Each structure stands twice: as C-alpha cells, then as structure tokens.
Amino acid sequence: LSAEQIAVLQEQGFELRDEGLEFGMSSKVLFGNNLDRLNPDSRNTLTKIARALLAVDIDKVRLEGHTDNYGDEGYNQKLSERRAESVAAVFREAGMPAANIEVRGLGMSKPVADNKTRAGRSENRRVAIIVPAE
Amino acid sequence: GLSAEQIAVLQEQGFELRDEGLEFGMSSKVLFGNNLDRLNPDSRNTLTKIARALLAVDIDKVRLEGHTDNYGDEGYNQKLSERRAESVAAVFREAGMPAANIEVRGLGMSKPVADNKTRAGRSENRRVAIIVPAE
C-alpha cells in the first residue's frame, strides 16, 4: 500500500478503485486484428508501464481479460484468459517474477458498458491491469 | 539470385532443400504452445535469430505459410493460419526486414504434411513454413 508508488501509478495512468488501482486498454488498442498477439506499439507502452511499476517495487499486478457477450461463452472465456496472459508476458519479459503476477480471464461476466450497442461491446473487450491494495 | 554464402547460412539455420527454394518449418506447438497467434518468448527469440542471420547475408525475399489441421471451422482455421503466419512475419519486420520483402499466406487446412487421422498427424499439420525462394 505504499504512498510514493501512487505518484508513479497515477503518472502511469492508473485510477483509483476499492481493491487498489486499475488501468485499462481496449483489446482493439492492444491486439488490433490479432487473436492474442499484442501489436508492437502496445507491447512497448506496456513494457514501459511494467518497468515503471517494477521500479517502485510493486508487490503484485493482476491482469484481467474481458470480452463482450457475442459468440461462444467458452471460447470467449478462453480468449480473455489468453489476452490477459499476453499482457502478463510483457511484465515477465520486463523482469517481474511470475510469482508476483496473477492472471484471470473473466469472459463476458464483468461488463463495463451496455452490450446492446457496438460501441458498448468494444468497451467491454479489454484487459485491466490491477494493483491490489493488500 | 541466390549465393553460396547465403546457402551456408540457410543450412546452419536449419533450412532444407525444396523445389525452387529453401524451407524451414516449425510446429504450431513449438511456436505458439497454448496461445492463439502470440509466439512463445523462446520461439520468438529463435525466429529473431534466424531473421538476423538471413538479413546479414541480405536475403531479398521470404515467404511465410500458415497451416492448420482439419478440425473445426474451416473459416476460422484459415483465419487462424493467416494470423499465425503474420505473427512470424512481424518477427522478420522487427528484426529489420522490409514489409515489401515478406509474403504472408494462410492455407488453412489445404496443404497437409501428415495424415490428420491421428492427433500426432494433426499436430504436425499445425505449422508455419519459412520459405526463401530461389528467384
């Protein structure tokens, strides 16, 4: 729960939540037309975030993958896992140990917008980077 | 338009003789593991190393061909195979090869190198081929 860490997190773009601090990127930004391969630029943005967080000795990051509710529920479950794993590999490659990374795929079960509209579904397809408080 | 010094490097990189070119093949199991089109870190490094070796001897053209087995939707499979050959292309672009010198094809299920009757014959069919043509 340290204090100086927040200044980096916020400067990294994290926002405040109950569990801790969270930063989100849409799957459109992260992967474009790919399945779970990150596009080079997003990988670089992520690498920079991973290194800023390591630098202030963050204890844990949790990566949570999400989809909208369009398509097979099981495939969407697995796709959200693989996409959160792609973000997690960026953290490992930047030097964070596996033991300090948790990965979850949520599928369609934790939406942040209305799946009625094409834009709401694009919002719901995302990976969240969470720094828990405890 | 191909040289002996180019051959020496292709061989030690693991390329083999084929019609009108040289080819290096890896299974989707080794390149991607459990992933969709993201390469495992160790296979990405292996591919980077090959790409550097071919750029060093100024390889003018590379073609990348993605294949699947026959299980599941033929449409998804062709998309999958295209996306997985594109994953290999991006390694070659990052290592310095121009986009113009790279040709990416997903052949889906259409060109199998094993039977597909067996789980092992299917895994073999899941693959990407790195083709250095002669002309």
Swiss-Prot record, chain B:
Its main location: membrane. Disruption phenotype: Deletion of the gene does not affect attachment or colony morphology. It is found in: Cell outer membrane. The keyword Lipoprotein applies. GO terms for cellular component: bacterial-type flagellum stator complex; cell outer membrane. Changing R63A: Weakens but does not abolish the interaction with YfiR. It is a lipid-anchor. It comes from the Bacteria. GO terms for biological process: bacterial-type flagellum-dependent cell motility. The keyword Lipoprotein applies. Keywords: Cell outer membrane, Lipoprotein, Membrane, Palmitate, Signal. Both lipid anchor in the outer membrane and peptidoglycan binding are required for full activity. Once activated by certain cell stress, the dimeric YfiB transforms from a compact conformation to a stretched conformation, allowing the periplasmic domain of the membrane-anchored YfiB to penetrate the cell wall and sequester the YfiR dimer. GMP enhances the binding affinity between YfiB and YfiR. Residues 20-135 form the OmpA-like domain. Dimerizes via its N-terminal region. Activates the diguanylate cyclase TpbB/YfiN by sequestering YfiR at the outer membrane, which counteracts the YfiR-mediated repression of TpbB/YfiN at the inner membrane and leads to increased c-di-GMP production. May act as a sensor of envelope stress. Belongs to the outer membrane OOP (TC 1.B.6) superfamily. Homodimer. Interacts with YfiR. The YfiB-YfiR complex is a 2:2 heterotetramer. This is Outer-membrane lipoprotein YfiB. It comes from Pseudomonas aeruginosa (strain ATCC 15692 / DSM 22644 / CIP 104116 / JCM 14847 / LMG 12228 / 1C / PRS 101 / PAO1). The lineage of its organism: Bacteria, Pseudomonadati, Pseudomonadota, Gammaproteobacteria, Pseudomonadales. The gene is yfiB. The chain holds residues 34 to 168 of 168 of the full protein.
